[PDB]
Amino acid sequence: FRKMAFPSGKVEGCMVQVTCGTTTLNGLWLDDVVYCPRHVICTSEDMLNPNYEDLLIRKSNHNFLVQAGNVQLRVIGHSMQNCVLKLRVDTANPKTPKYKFVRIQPGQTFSVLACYNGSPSGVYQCAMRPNFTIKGSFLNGSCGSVGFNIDYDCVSFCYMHHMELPTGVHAGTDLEGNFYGPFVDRQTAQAAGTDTTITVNVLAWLYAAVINGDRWFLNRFTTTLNDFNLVAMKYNYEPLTQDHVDILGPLSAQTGIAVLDMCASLKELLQNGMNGRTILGSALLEDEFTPFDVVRQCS
Amino acid sequence: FRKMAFPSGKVEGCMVQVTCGTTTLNGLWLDDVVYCPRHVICTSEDMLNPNYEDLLIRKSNHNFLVQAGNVQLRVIGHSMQNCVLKLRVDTANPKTPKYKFVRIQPGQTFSVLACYNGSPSGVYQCAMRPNFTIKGSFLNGSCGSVGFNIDYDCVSFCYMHHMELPTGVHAGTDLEGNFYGPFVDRQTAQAAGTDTTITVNVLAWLYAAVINGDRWFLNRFTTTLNDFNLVAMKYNYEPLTQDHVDILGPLSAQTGIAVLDMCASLKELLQNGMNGRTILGSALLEDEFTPFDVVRQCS
Ligand SMILES: *[C@H](O)[C@H](C[C@@H]1CCNC1=O)NC(=O)[C@H](CC(C)C)NC(=O)OCc1ccccc1
Numbered sequence A, B: 001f002r003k004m005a006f007p008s009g010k011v012e013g014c015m016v017q018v019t020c021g022t023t024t025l026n027g028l029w030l031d032d033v034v035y036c037p038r039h040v041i042c043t044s045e046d047m048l049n050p051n052y053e054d055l056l057i058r059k060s061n062h063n064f065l066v067q068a069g070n071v072q073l074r075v076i077g078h079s080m081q082n083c084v085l086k087l088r089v090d091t092a093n094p095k096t097p098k099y100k101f102v103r104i105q106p107g108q109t110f111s112v113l114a115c116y117n118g119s120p121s122g123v124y125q126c127a128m129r130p131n132f133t134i135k136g137s138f139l140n141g142s143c144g145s146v147g148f149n150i151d152y153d154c155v156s157f158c159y160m161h162h163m164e165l166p167t168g169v170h171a172g173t174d175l176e177g178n179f180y181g182p183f184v185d186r187q188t189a190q191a192a193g194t195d196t197t198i199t200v201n202v203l204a205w206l207y208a209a210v211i212n213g214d215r216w217f218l219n220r221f222t223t224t225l226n227d228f229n230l231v232a233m234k235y236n237y238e239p240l241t242q243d244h245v246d247i248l249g250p251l252s253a254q255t256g257i258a259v260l261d262m263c264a265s266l267k268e269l270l271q272n273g274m275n276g277r278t279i280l281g282s283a284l285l286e287d288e289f290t291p292f293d294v295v296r297q298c299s
């Protein structure tokens, strides 16, 4: 089982660069609007406690340099929506895919197209942690890189990159500019809160093991969802939601193992350990594969 | 620090579907030629023991159905080059990138664009194992998917997919149709030679772990090159050459850790084990990052 990104071409055709003064970052060109992090309007010294409303008052359309490659797109309007800037340009992007803006939940995975100066550099899968950080690979100039899922040629944009935390993990917004987690776009000392293991994804991984014939851990017990959630939190595991139970439906139907029966198997794993045995060749339980990821890879 | 693939857009625009009789796989459409695995011409009975030159002489241009999205391309000629078929079509692919065909060396990495029915499905990074298999993620209908590297917008195609071994690893050819490894495109269970670990890549990855604030595995010892290689061979690691030591030069200068000092670190890791500790979140020593891969991502 491997981390597989979505093909990135539909998003590559949407990446541009946005410069204000000497600060350049990336933007997302869809139809006639370019979306980018609002801190592009900041001077390096204005990043500690910026007054974005005041900094933007001093900006006009002609202060924004938007480029597809080296080709300038003329800006004809600007506005700020939460933590993102929306620059209306005079050209509709002919490579605009069918798309949606979606806000994802902790545990969901997405592909990141890492970009610098509007030029895509690499693509990789990330999972949103329960503390609303991601373990990205981002360098200076990566802001405005986006995360996405693709379903039947419709690109669902879910993440735009804004910052690195001192622990070296990353934080950002949805495409309406609302941060995931309790972070703000100021170059201040912020810290990721204590993280937890993504229970729904561990369960998805156990189903993947069962699908492939590795099922020693299937026990004879069951549990209630509430009883499981209370024990799981004693082990730094996330509690399950009703939505988690439902997204495990397909894998549960495929294997014939009830979701609550699998929870009881996981609970036993937590209370006694793996006892020197592996699952899918690994001694660690993997929590960055969603139920969709498991089915997507197997079909 | 993550396993990161190249952006796949330049390759996506080249993928097509190729059908012959009941057999469907993917092709690579560059200019006016479509490249695909030659076993597309085999029925299920032919797959067991095919005489490809005999099977091919009996095919006509119209036995080949090539589809690029919804439009059908007309095959106007066809030839076989080793294990690859070259179908000449009456349309030039307007999305053909600047490209080269290259044969990669064991230990080098590349990105795979997994495709089904001519449609790209996922992208991920692979390494050519020393035994000339790759540890991929490929299902029925993935043949003709390609591996590649991208430099300054020039796509270097290095791999085309043909088969899965009983152990679950994968085998294929360069774009000239020559297999990597002692494998043949016949429907028989084939074993690979004993695999070995790519030493220069493990060392590059340890240096990446230091660039990301992890040093628990470092020690005060040092070792000679020959003494290290005696231990490496004992653990089924590939020899480390002076060319390798030189290629690791930049990473050693960045961290101030001499190559042979890091070799003493790896020797201790190999002789003592990892003690249930982890490096970059991994419980095993990772060998599918090249020194170039580490530098590109880390800088
Ligand atoms: C966006 O281009 C950039 C991405 C960072 C750069 C290095 N790796 C990254 O992920 N974002 C920032 O530089 C961001 C800007 C703020 C307005 C949000 N600042 C940031 O990430 O700061 C890190 C930091 C904060 C406080 C002290 C020291 C470093």
Ligand SMILES: *[C@H](O)[C@H](C[C@@H]1CCNC1=O)NC(=O)[C@H](CC(C)C)NC(=O)OCc1ccccc1
Residues within 6 Å of the ligand: B025, B039, B047, B138, B139, B140, B141, B142, B143, B144, B161, B162, B163, B164, B165, B166, B170, B184, B185, B186, B187, B188, B189, B190
């Ligand atoms: C091409 O689409 C396909 C890809 C395989 C299918 C499953 N995963 C893959 O990667 N290739 C084949 O089906 C290939 C066709 C031969 C003519 C080369 N056969 C194959 O992979 O068979 C493997 C095998 C044969 C006999 C015993 C055990 C394994």
